[PDB]
Design a binder for these strands. Structure first.
Ligand SMILES: [Mg+2]
Ligand SMILES: [Mg+2]
Ligand SMILES: [Mg+2]
Ligand SMILES: [Mg+2]
Ligand SMILES: [Mg+2]
Ligand SMILES: [Mg+2]
Ligand SMILES: [Mg+2]
Ligand SMILES: [Mg+2]
Ligand SMILES: [Mg+2]
Ligand SMILES: [Mg+2]
Ligand SMILES: [Mg+2]
Ligand SMILES: [Mg+2]
Ligand SMILES: [Mg+2]
Ligand SMILES: [Mg+2]
Ligand SMILES: [Mg+2]
Ligand SMILES: [Mg+2]
Ligand SMILES: [Mg+2]
Ligand SMILES: [Mg+2]
Lengths: 117, 53, 102, 109, 141
RNA sequence: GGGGCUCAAACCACACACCGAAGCUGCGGGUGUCACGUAAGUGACGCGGUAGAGGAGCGUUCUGUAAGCCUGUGAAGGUG
RNA sequence: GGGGAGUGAAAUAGAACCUGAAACCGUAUGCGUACAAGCAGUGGGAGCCUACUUGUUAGGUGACUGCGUACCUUUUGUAU
């Protein structure tokens, strides 16, 4: 029973060349280059799920810091001021109140100063 | 000598961008109404309205 | 009218009429959900925050649907060492809808 | 619109791209004058095709020879005939001999 | 999701700095903070939101200790043996406005945003500026 | 590492605060071994990996089931 | 060599003729690029375009910006 492998090799090549479209040059059209640029573009998509969580945390902090200096503190004395009491509001929903709901942010900052910390 | 890497579709098409054509020195003869080249004998044999050949 | 409710180990910026995607919780479709874990309640300008939590305030929600979103890929490759391993993932979620900020 | 073809024409493709780009989008009155005076091998062949596309619009349709503006000129590639040629120190090498397909398409709009 | 600024909905202002005895690199760290936009709550890294700066005395600036007769400013010309140097004191009589620009330029990113944050800096060796139309407000009193 | 720094942005004592990993915690999924609660109707603490040892699967061609079943209202293929 | 016209169920079945793929080469339409440095991708992301069911939807481009020195084989050890 001779088997010829010319029809199930083709389905696996088109499955590679579909994930690898939108790429420059010969990375999107010939197979011995487009296999390297699918494995490499899958390692980057694995590392950058961790680095996504580090690039917003470093963005939330630098917006609380700018907003809390305009009222009369720093960032580091504000976090010690909120944790003298227990206000328990994270960085994602303080950097929302820093931009949009600016009057409610000032009513938080005055209570950290009243916390004397 | 030889190259070390091949040239892509971009760096091959950029070379041949300085390569176009032109021959627009055309002129209409006043008498016969025949088109020819500027400062040349018309293909019937008239130059500035005079048969020469 | 905006609250800060804490659903799945993380909190949200919930308004009066929001659709909102929450991690999967154990309740059927159509039933109503209350939230007793609100952290600041504002209204017009009248804003109050919790001492650790705000007393008395509730947020009523109900489940629209369920589902799984956006299949992602995982490639664990090592150069030059004869090792490569793949896996797929689709995380569950639960879409709810907010009615009233009590 | 009406078309014309010349499938099988001894000049190569790349040499005859330089005459197609010169006239793509003009009127056929002055298109027959750029090709009457150009000094290249492709220009005598392309004018034989351009006046074949016009005479089809006059006989197969009722299109006048005035309102025609040449719309789509493209030069494809055709079969290549492979031959050898000897070089020095025993080694012989191989020569191709190319051709092309020309398609001039005029439109009466 | 978190808010990002938009370049067609940005608010920029006009500040004027007096450098009349300020230490060079302690002045310049506050210009470079306010050109990038770390003083605004809506700071985003990828698009730019900063205030124009006008500096009105680029010759009264002060450096500390023995650095006036030192601190060569090296740069190379491309040709062989073309290294060149000029100290702090001789430079400030040739072009006073290029002392305070090269200190701020090295405290910015080296991006095509850094080249765009640098165009908001405008220094003058004189005593008045041709920006009375824009009416800059005073800061750092 | 660069700008730049002189009661310091250096050195010595010293005090709180913050920042900081795929580490720990929270929430949601998935699997391996053992224990039973008829051992999944079930808890516990486990899950980097080359050479290499062990376990469990997909697909291709031909034969049985196939004188069946599907198809000219449209097969196999090719392409979305 | 074509453009018709006729034969045929079908000439993009026309004799270099069933199906007719990939590399390679073109022609149209949309969006981005001529003061900006590198395995050319990935995370965030402005704007524009099309269909929408009129847009806390879909599709196509990706200015700007953070991290990022291909694959195999031999090796104590390779971006090399
Ligand atoms: Mg011989
Ligand atoms: Mg001291
Ligand atoms: Mg972490
Ligand atoms: Mg862990
Ligand atoms: Mg293992
Ligand atoms: Mg078969
Ligand atoms: Mg089919
Ligand atoms: Mg018939
Ligand atoms: Mg067909
Ligand atoms: Mg057929
Ligand atoms: Mg053929
Ligand atoms: Mg047949
Ligand atoms: Mg055929
Ligand atoms: Mg092209
Ligand atoms: Mg370059
Ligand atoms: Mg560089
Ligand atoms: Mg070894
Ligand atoms: Mg090598």
């Amino acid at each position: 029973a001779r088997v010829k492998r010319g029809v199930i090799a083709r389905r696996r090549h088109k499955k590679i060349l579909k994930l690898a479209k939108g790429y420059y040059g010969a990375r999107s059209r010939v197979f011995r280059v487009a296999k390297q640029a699918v494995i490499k573009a899958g390692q980057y998509a694995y590392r950058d799920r961790r680095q996504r969580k580090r690039q917003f945390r470093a963005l939330w902090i630098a917006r609380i810091n700018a907003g809390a200096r305009q009222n009369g503190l720093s960032y580091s004395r504000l976090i010690a001021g909120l944790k003298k009491a227990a206000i328990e509001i994270d960085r994602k929903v303080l950097a929302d109140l820093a931009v949009n709901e600016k009057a409610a942010f000032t009513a938080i900052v005055e209570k950290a100063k009243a916390s004397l910390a | 000598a030889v190259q070390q890497n091949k040239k892509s579709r971009s760096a091959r098409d950029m070379r041949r961008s300085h390569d176009a054509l032109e021959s627009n020195a055309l002129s209409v003869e006043k008498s016969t109404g025949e088109v020819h080249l500027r400062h040349h004998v018309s293909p019937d044999g008239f130059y500035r309205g005079r048969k020469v050949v | 009218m905006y609250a800060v409710i804490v659903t799945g180990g993380k909190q949200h910026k919930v308004t009066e009429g929001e659709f909102l995607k929450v991690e999967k919780l154990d309740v059927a479709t159509g039933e109503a959900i209350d939230f007793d874990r609100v952290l600041l309640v504002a209204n017009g300008e009248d804003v109050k925050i919790g001492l650790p939590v705000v007393e008395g305030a509730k947020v009523t929600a109900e489940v629209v649907s369920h589902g799984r979103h956006d299949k992602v890929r995982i490639i664990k490759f090592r150069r030059r060492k004869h090792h490569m391993k793949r896996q797929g993932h689709r995380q569950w979620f639960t879409e709810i809808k907010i009615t009233g900020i009590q | 619109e009406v078309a014309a073809k010349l499938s099988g024409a001894r000049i190569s493709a790349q040499k005859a791209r330089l005459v197609a780009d010169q006239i793509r989008g003009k009127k056929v009155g002055e298109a027959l004058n750029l090709l009457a005076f150009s000094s290249k091998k492709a220009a005598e062949i392309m004018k034989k095709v351009l006046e074949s596309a016009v005479a089809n619009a006059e006989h197969n349709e009722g299109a006048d020879v005035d309102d025609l503006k040449v719309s789509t000129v493209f030069v494809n590639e055709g079969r290549s005939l492979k031959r050898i040629m000897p070089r020095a120190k025993g080694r012989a090498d191989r020569i191709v001999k190319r051709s092309c397909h020309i398609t001039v398409k005029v439109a009466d709009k | 999701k978190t808010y990002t600024a938009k370049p067609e909905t940005v608010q920029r202002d006009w500040f004027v700095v007096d450098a009349a005895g300020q230490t060079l690199g302690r002045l310049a760290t506050e210009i470079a903070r306010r050109l990038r936009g770390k003083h605004k709550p809506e700071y985003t890294p990828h698009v730019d939101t900063g205030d124009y700066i006008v500096v009105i005395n680029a010759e009264q600036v002060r450096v500390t200790g023995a650095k006036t007769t030192d601190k060569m400013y090296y740069h190379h010309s491309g040709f062989p043996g073309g290294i060149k140097s000029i100290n702090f004191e001789k430079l400030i009589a040739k072009a006073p406005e290029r002392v305070i620009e090269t200190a701020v330029k090295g405290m910015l990113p080296k991006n095509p945003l850094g080249r765009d944050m640098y165009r908001k800096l405008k220094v003058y060796k004189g005593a008045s500026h041709p920006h009375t139309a824009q009416q800059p407000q005073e800061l750092k009193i």
